[PDB]
Input
Amino acid sequence: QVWPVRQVRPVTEKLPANHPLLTGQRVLDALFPCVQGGTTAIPGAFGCGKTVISQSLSKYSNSDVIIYVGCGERGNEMSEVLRDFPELTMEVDGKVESIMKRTALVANTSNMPVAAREASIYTGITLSEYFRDMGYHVSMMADSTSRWAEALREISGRLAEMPADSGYPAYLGARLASFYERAGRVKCLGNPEREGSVSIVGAVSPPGGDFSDPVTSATLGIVQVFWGLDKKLAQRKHFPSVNWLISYSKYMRALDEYYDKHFTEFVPLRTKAKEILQEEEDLAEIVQLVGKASLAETDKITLEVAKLIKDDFLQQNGYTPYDRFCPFYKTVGMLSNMISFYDMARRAVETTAQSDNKITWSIIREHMGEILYKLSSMKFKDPVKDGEAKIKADYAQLLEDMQNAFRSL
Amino acid sequence: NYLSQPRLTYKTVSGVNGPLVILDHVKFPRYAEIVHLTLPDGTKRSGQVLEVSGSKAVVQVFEGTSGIDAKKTSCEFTGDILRTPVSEDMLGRVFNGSGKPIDRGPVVLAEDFLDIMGQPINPQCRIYPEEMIQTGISAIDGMNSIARGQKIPIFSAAGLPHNEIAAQICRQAGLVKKENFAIVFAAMGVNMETARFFKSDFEENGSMDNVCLFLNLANDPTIERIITPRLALTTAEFLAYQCEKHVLVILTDMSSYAEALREVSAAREEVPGRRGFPGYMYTDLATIYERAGRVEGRNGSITQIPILTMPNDDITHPIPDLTGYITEGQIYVDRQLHNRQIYPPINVLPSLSRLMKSAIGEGMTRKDHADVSNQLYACYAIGKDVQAMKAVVGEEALTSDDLLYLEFLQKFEKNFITQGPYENRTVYETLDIGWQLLRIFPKEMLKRIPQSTLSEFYPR
Amino acid sequence: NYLSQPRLTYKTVSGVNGPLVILDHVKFPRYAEIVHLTLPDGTKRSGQVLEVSGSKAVVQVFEGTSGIDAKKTSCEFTGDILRTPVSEDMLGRVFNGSGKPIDRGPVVLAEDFLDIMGQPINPQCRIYPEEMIQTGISAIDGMNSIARGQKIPIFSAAGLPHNEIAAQICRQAGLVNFAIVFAAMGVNMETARFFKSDFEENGSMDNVCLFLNLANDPTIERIITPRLALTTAEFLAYQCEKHVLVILTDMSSYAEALREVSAAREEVPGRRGFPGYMYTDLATIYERAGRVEGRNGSITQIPILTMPNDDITHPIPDLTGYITEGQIYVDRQLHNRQIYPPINVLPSLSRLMKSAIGEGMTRKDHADVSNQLYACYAIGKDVQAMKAVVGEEALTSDDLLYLEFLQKFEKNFITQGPYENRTVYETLDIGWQLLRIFPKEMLKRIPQSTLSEFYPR
Amino acid sequence: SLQTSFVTLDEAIKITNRRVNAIEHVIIPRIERTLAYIITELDEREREE
Ligand SMILES: Nc1ncnc2c1ncn2[C@@H]1O[C@H](COP(=O)(O)OP(=O)(O)O)[C@@H](O)[C@H]1O
Ligand SMILES: [Mg+2]
Output
């Protein structure tokens, strides 16, 4: 069949989204969730990891089909996908299958004709709506929407049109908003009564790295999830380079009733982790100006567990074999142990700080260096070489290992 | 009398560009006239004459110019400007941004046809509004109080919960007790989840028989936004000034309206204002915002609550900037309060209501309401200055009085501002939550309050 | 088939303004065609058709419009777009920025005439680059490894030694010979002498091709100079099967000439007044690199940049970093401290490094050691920044370990001197020695199985 | 008397020097970067106009 790429394919009804799009990152899946039918933006300066997040999400997500769009970006970033995806396999019925069997690609690299970048976007979303109508859950990656906005600026410029913000045409916001409205979860047309979805994950490439960029500023008015990357995390090799202070998701109130059924313990842990990071951010300016010696032992513990979470939970190298993909059980198990250590270390100080003989974080460190090195090592446990049972058994052993040390204070 | 004479139909299309079609050989063209376009495939669109000169007319097309051509497409000129049908049967109906039904009901069988620009109400014939709307929200009713017949926007930004504040005002609004609103709701450029949220809330409240909805979603045509506020306000003016209802009008993103103006102005190659917006943006916005309030000898009223998404959180941007020069206040929704899970995220410092001065106080609400609002404001202003100093110097530099202001700042955000989405507080609960914070200080610090108000309400 | 029908010549110049000449009564104009202009004094100049409309053609003139007139100036239209004559004789030649010889040798006998603009390679036919080049420079090889076929520019600034680093890379590159194609845009004569001298001093010059546009040469030649050079690299790599290293000298001179050309046409500006399409334009140069299916040859690009006021957010380094596969960053603060090479690793990157290293490629530790050296260097910088506020008496011994690593890293791993040629294996073991300072439980980028094999030596 | 004064005064010298270093190395650079950005963006708005 033949369809006009600029016209939305019809459906019986759009539906609320009720199920997570798992990315296999610990950050993203815990702190800033996304859904089957969701809309996401990934803004960030050059080298932050936008294409590596797009490729990781393409390799490891819970989607039936992937449509991958590379408008205005590198030919080697397309060639990597063609080289990798035949070799990498998912498992079906006790049999392995190449993930290239579920993938389609739409390439228009940074040296191909500028006008064709508009056609890449509408081709890729039309291909995504076609498989949605079969009752599949589809994900579309658009590895830079700034390259499309920048193509509109040249065509608009040669048509001699009046510019809006920074040379872009006044219709740019309407072109973006009507593209993101093609995402969703649906009752399909026709009569076998199936349901399907399209999630859209649009990367954004703000010139100068500043999110006051017209494309970023327009896109953040439209999307429901924002994964804002930071170059000063990327320079430390802190990956994914996501700024957890500015990033957000609007789907948390929709997903809480899923987590209450499948991962009952997670919502308190998510709440505590955000508070520990928010407290460490409030402490860090006082530490920088005043020089740390003023801090109470609660605040030393809060800085130390915030550092533990930042360095050994949020951080995840995407190439090394144990952390390519992090399952949600591994993610909840790791988080539960770090938050449980916070509550035990705080309990020990908060119970004893009134007495003549009392606990301090220096005592806790010196007493527990082996348990601290076990907590930092939890990330190295491997989802396929060790497996679920061995991972969950080890994380329960760390809980007794730290409990015996706190029974011993 | 009627237009009984026939309508001319022209195939003389001469240019097509963005939202605009240009025709020539047009007989005695009329400015602001409506045009109906039949495409080569028989699709029907509609448009309006933005300029006339000699035999040439420039038409903005509401549904967009895709598929139009310079030979087969034909325009029928209606002989008249845009008049909408109206009736009281429009309450409990759902329409698109063009005013066509989407509830699967019939089209409006009119009680009248009204010009969507309205008619100028004489400044001699207006009534000054003094009845307070109790919105049920303490940060509004205590410090930014709203009169029935006011124009007062919510200024907000991307990701913030301005839709929940709007829905909560619609659930909870009434007069202070020592009538209930007809609601007209317009949406420009909203996503499907926003449209579903408001429609679902009015059904959840069990009150859809008293509300009219006009919806233009983010996939619907952008030039329909030019008329959507004017369909909504023309309906509110019939209901208020001919059927004597008390109307509340919600206009849910003025920022996506102002962008549709910038497209048309850019396509016409007009001389810019700031950030590329039309040079006439103030004078256009004023035609929407000044359709509000009360008139002498008629029992109904219109209260206006626009909503703005401010870009980059910039309150000096031409959209929120010009809105303050026309409306009687603003309510400001703040990212720093939202990031801390405070709800409502209303920041009381940049928020204002210009008509509150005469709507509150003795006989209106309670005799302390003016004094308590001033003192709560001054305490929060001082506490925010102490907080900003403290981060430089540490708590060892602060006096016992600086700790009284810094304690108040927490207790105020925790108890007075923070409320939750279905909690409804009277003015009386709002004031007496207020006094529990003013008791943090000794009497000698409460400088905004006269001794009679201290003597009567502090000892309790 | 050959263009056998004769060329038209025109005196119909209807106007002149800025760098643009405007002919009328032109018979069937061709967009992007080349035109030869003869001035009244008999000087020849060339230009290219930048616009066509009915009987009119707009020409930009490469040597400028000064002294052109509406009456005596005459234009000959070539019937064709800009093509360059190419042969394998071009190695061991020197040309100006428009491809005319300047070595007192003859003009090129073509093996073919190639379109200067190249042609986009199909992403299906690209081969991902995975063979590591050893430059022997430890700050590159150990922490920004270069794959054969990469684009990896040198971001530098005025007064820094980016010429000397680029010469050292040309002198030392090999697998764990290159043909060199070198372009210069807007160089002073002492820069032009430095490279030509160094290539003759290393005896290499019979295997180097140079295109020179100096600071006094025409500006609009600069926008064809890298396209002449890359067309020569594409013949040498993808028809003669050679491995080519292409050096493009000061891309900020290319971008500045492009801004000056575009400002005369009044095209939409981007940031800091550069053309709205500058990303696309630079991408047509930088994407002319890599390996391809079924052919042995390859093109590696190392463009050199000058950052205005050392600002990496300026559109030139910014839009270049968005396209290229990393960057090497040359730092004024290391240069002022008399270190060589001044390569600050933190703002630097290589994207193709991740698959060009490790087991079978280099050594099993390489991917772990590199990431731990980045972590300790970033933390050492944070402690040095803390010390400037609170003074040494506030620092714990753990802070002093990172601040000792910092001093030893810049003296042993970074500092090298201009002719030292370290193996990857020397670079890796110099890596482990600095990491050995820290008690092993601090090495939290490295898994137990790597630590227990390499740290105890 | 002199020694308890001296201990108190030593701490006050250390605190004062810490503040001077913070103004010189944290606060003034942050203001000067902010000021340079504002001066840059005002030229961009002017070129757009
Ligand atoms: N999750 C990650 N894990 C490991 N390395 C990463 C990760 N994300 C980014 N990188 C490194 O950073 C480089 C640049 O990432 P990329 O996605 O291409 O950034 P960009 O936003 O510019 O497209 C990668 O080639 C890789 O070397
Ligand atoms: Mg990318």
